Symmetry: C4
Subunit: 332 residues, 4 copies
């Protein structure tokens, strides 16, 4: 049967930290932490399809992002500045001259949760209240995340939010995928004809450039390591992939594959930000993960070159809705 | 036919007090009072499945909770305090050092009502306006309760609300179930692996504890009286069950049974607070009910240990929606 | 075919006054005025089922109510006063010591309109903006009325509204029905066990009274004239029927019949206010209508005895929705 | 397959200008610019059905309107004044004594965009944030435009918006149609019995006039050039058609035809404003288009004679929704 359960493993911020398991009748078990509404593991016949830390306890010892619901804004904001009309709002500069990842972001907070299931799905709904002014963002914000598993081995991620003030909001699920192997060795096809080259600060500075003729061309199936180990100046600059790709609208958004498994990625986001875990090195808390072991498909609106953030602006009471679907299937 | 009617029996607060009857074609009659949007009786072939007072008039003579729509917050709030950001709001201390049951709560107000029916349901919709600042709660609040009976002997309870200010809201239906017998003698199975132990003040103080190895273990069908008459320190502390149970997500939330009847409880709440009518003693207005005659399944977000009430916070204009389904069927 | 059209006949308030015709394939033609979103005629095989003035031009010469969308509040408000919390708002005293019919109400304004049709319906949607403070009511208000005709000779009336401020709103469609004859001679059955007796000022003063044993008993089919010509003190007081009836929830709300036609009335309102055109006398602008020629079924929340108007209070941005269905069929 | 793609061709306002192509399996390709959410081309078996500039780059060199999403208000506002209650708001006088086309309107802004497709549709969703006070309009505004192509050669246009302040909003899609020929030579049938004659300033001054007996009568199929070359005083005044037509509600709103093609126009707007490109003259940036080469069917609420703009007033948080459907089919 489709079923759910959870176990409490710790306390943080006067709240319980739990590990929630969703199971189906098709060989899949999904593990979620209410800490950061974090996707911890995706087990297909016992094999983990994503990067995970050594233990659930490890996730809250420091900020390592993997699996997390990162907000209020995932990625960078130039000079931490948001201009609307003749007004500019200043966000905290936690990334040198810029702002990144919401400051002390939502991936670091303990969310409330509620598991449920029916004849078609096993799911967990998570909620978080973030007060007006937290990390200098305007608006009381209510966030709702759902991870929902069906019998077709599709894991659906839904992230909804509402603010009571004009604000900016562009969160992302920060899961790294490896299909039980290493992302460097995996094949990728992606329906994106353009990417955003970035500057030394890691932000776009000239809008879209064609992927054609560059390391970023995944229009035809290509080994990820071919891009990572190329002499491409943008790859060298960011020590691997660390780049927004602008989707062309054809389905699926991305298809990641090994000889044994395939992952089909779909989303209502306009972009995928691909980061190949360029900084991992088998040390510290994350000693079980090395460089290029996993790759994100961060489904969000792309980071912007400057203070025009119209795309990610929410009116008071406007419903934000992000969907991502990760479908796991058998290889060729 | 599915049908409705009502009778006026009294006046209170310059309004009429009525008793509304919903009937189906499957042997069920449900009686509702617009006073407190209160579930008065659930008759299955003439046999009452819930605790009821001697007469409808008795419900409004004093606060005895049974059947009532208790709000704005059912249960306790530590120190009556709600912290959001750097702001704390103080609620009335009607429970010693703490706040309980909304002060002069919604179970004590006269709601407006409207019966209706169709080929599938007989229902009554009830509404209440609670002004900003009543019982020191922020926000004008509009509440809508519905009791809806179908031909499958399911009684659906829907409780919706909206506030025009940032506020806190966690109401509950306070029906006590007995299946025409005494709850102490009934069997219970409940899909909850954790409960919240409470302190001397009746509030949680350490988050979840496993039900395994305690009186609170209803994972396998167990006579309620076995828990009530056990030497468990938490049972002794609260003179019986008076505890939040955190649901594991598997269906149903609870199954209460006698040899003759079963009640299947489903809800979109994350918790059930179980209270076994520990204080009843066949005296006063409630002289027809004794200790442990009935048990609640209060479907709400759980009472919290402190002033972090994020789970029950509503933005202005945010729709709150609680569902409970009580399905009555024949025994084994 | 289901079809619509309109003709312009006059100018008022720098706007065009039009008469809109909805037609079906089942012998029905419905005439609507954008002046007051007014139901002008309901023609079944050429025979008018409702009271109408001599000409469309007559409707805007003075306030005669028939067919009109009367708001913001249809009927009386005691002392013109609305109490919410510790605040009381004062409405204009256009009814002696009381307020009635919204002051210079929405039945006196020129609405915008748009006809449309499809394979199932012919309809006209009408809209009106009423500014904050008009007739001393709070809130900018957007009203939307729809008259929609199908091939089953059902005319659906939908009235929706939203305010940007906490406010009170209880409009009604003021159509008088006669089935091409005189209402005094028609039979009526109504699923209401209670009515609200009124005082000398025409307002309720003691809540519900049983219809049983009074002129107001239409639980079993009865000639309307039997009530009108009875010695009942409430009938004498109001010179006929002028009374709220509280619906019991069984279907339909009312059934009005002659030997040739029947009208089946359904509504999502809790009450019908019945007024038998007690003041008409074949004089003035309305010289074609005499006493008791038609009867309203004003589907609204009932007039209240005092300043507690919780039932009709709207939060800012709360959607009000009233439906009425008038189905015309062949007699027995 | 239904498919989408886009190409970047320029930069403007620190954003990329792209040309988005939607294609189906029925011979249609639609080209959209994110600059002004502009409909650039509609190709049916290689033949363009609408007016287009020489190149996508031409659209942003100056304001020429064709294809554009023109807002916040398309068309004129008398004296630039909006009266609500006792308040009047003043808009910029960019049209002599009047206001027109939103000032520096939304057809001149770079919108964000996202293509997508499925088994039934190929679409592009575009969004724009317009700050409070831009062009002296109140309210932060979020606009969403969608162009959606199906396999029946219907192109659907959806335009939605929400403001956080009481405001006025009446945008339009400004596509000119020619069916690969010249509009002057095309036949038109239109289900509108009334038009709004205009004054020297191009605004209505007397409400509706019958089309019967005038050049504006398209109730029966008529060559557009017959109206354009007539001696009608309103045609002479505006150098061709430049007039609101008020729809009668029968389907379709308009049918434009050549010997080879037909265009079926449907809309939820109450009016179509018809402008026959009266000013084009094969000079300047638009040197490829001459007088009467194309005709708009601007689906909006009609321009008003004065400061009563109730029809186009939006409450804060009220959802505006315009639909237009353009279906292209084979001729007779
Ligand atoms: Cl801006
Ligand atoms: Cl490494
Ligand atoms: Cl907080
Ligand atoms: Cl006892
Ligand atoms: Cl009140
Ligand atoms: Cl008379
Ligand atoms: Cl006004
Ligand atoms: Cl020319
Ligand atoms: Mg601060
Ligand atoms: Mg390694
Ligand atoms: Mg106070
Ligand atoms: Mg006893
Ligand atoms: Mg005033
Ligand atoms: Mg007469
Ligand atoms: Mg300004
Ligand atoms: Mg030419």
């Amino acid at each position: 049967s489709l079923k759910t359960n959870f176990v409490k493993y710790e306390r943080k911020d006067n709240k319980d930290l739990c590990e929630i398991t969703l199971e189906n009748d098709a060989g899949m078990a999904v593990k979620v932490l209410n800490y950061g509404a974090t996707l911890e593991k995706v087990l297909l016949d016992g094999e983990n399809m994503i990067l995970s830390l050594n233990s659930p306890e490890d996730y809250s010892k420091e900020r390592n992002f993997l699996g997390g619901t990162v907000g209020r804004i995932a990625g960078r904001v130039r000079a931490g500045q948001w201009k609307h009309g003749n007004e500019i709002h200043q966000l905290p500069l936690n990334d040198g001259d810029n702002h990144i990842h919401g400051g002390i972001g939502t991936d670091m907070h303990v969310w409330d949760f509620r598991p449920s299931c029916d004849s078609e799905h096993a799911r967990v709904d998570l909620t978080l209240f973030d007060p007006d002014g937290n990390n200098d963002y305007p608006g009381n914000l209510k966030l709702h995340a759902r991870y929902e598993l069906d019998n077709e081995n599709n894991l659906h991620y839904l992230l909804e939010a509402v603010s009571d003030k004009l604000t900016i909001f562009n969160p992302v699920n920060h899961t790294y995928f490896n299909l039980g192997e290493r992302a460097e060795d995996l094949n990728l096809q992606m329906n994106a004809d353009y990417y955003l080259p970035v500057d030394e600060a890691g932000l776009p500075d000239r809008g879209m450039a064609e992927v054609a003729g560059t390391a970023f061309d995944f229009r035809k199936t290509k080994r990820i390591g071919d891009a990572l180990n190329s002499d491409d100046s943008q790859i060298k600059l960011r020590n691997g992939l660390d780049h927004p790709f602008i989707l062309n609208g054809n389905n699926p958004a991305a298809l990641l594959s090994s000889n044994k498994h395939r992952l089909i990625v779909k989303t209502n986001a306009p972009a995928l930000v691909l980061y190949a875990g360029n900084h991992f090195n088998h040390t510290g808390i994350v000693n079980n993960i090395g460089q290029y072991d996993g790759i994100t498909f961060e489904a969000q609106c792309p980071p912007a070159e400057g203070n025009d953030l119209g795309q990610i602006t929410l009116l008071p009471f406007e419903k934000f809705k992000r969907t991502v679907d990760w479908k796991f299937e058998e290889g060729h």
